[PDB]
Amino acid sequence: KAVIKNADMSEEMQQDAVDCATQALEKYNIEPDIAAYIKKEFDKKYNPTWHCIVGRNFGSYVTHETRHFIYFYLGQVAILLFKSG
Template structure:
């Protein structure tokens, strides 16, 4: 990744594309993603940070995919899914049983 514009994470536009979770959870997801992006430049490391934070706070088993270009089709637990952008990065976060 290495995009210097990510140094200003709080300023990046956040866009939620699809959601099935509480407002509290979605706010935590966005805040966690911004923290991950401010301390990591590799997409895999950003995804790992977000996944670990959600596993800790909301119990296992969360999955996180981060990138600029990917397709997906997933099954998730009810009220445990969000797909959003922070700046140029798409973040897909969901929980399975």
């Protein structure tokens, strides 16, 4: 049920992102608990420093390392995952 709106990252890192959000939703309800679970996994997997937003209604303007940004919908939420710093 993932729908990838915008991205700048390897199709293989996008999948990973989604699998990680999927896992995040199987075990968290609260938007900031979901975000942190994902953020910390990507730090682990792909080194720091990542940022993740989990929300039903937001927008944003961020800067990210080239090839390391994704924004998508999963479930009833929108996920923004990107690396910067």
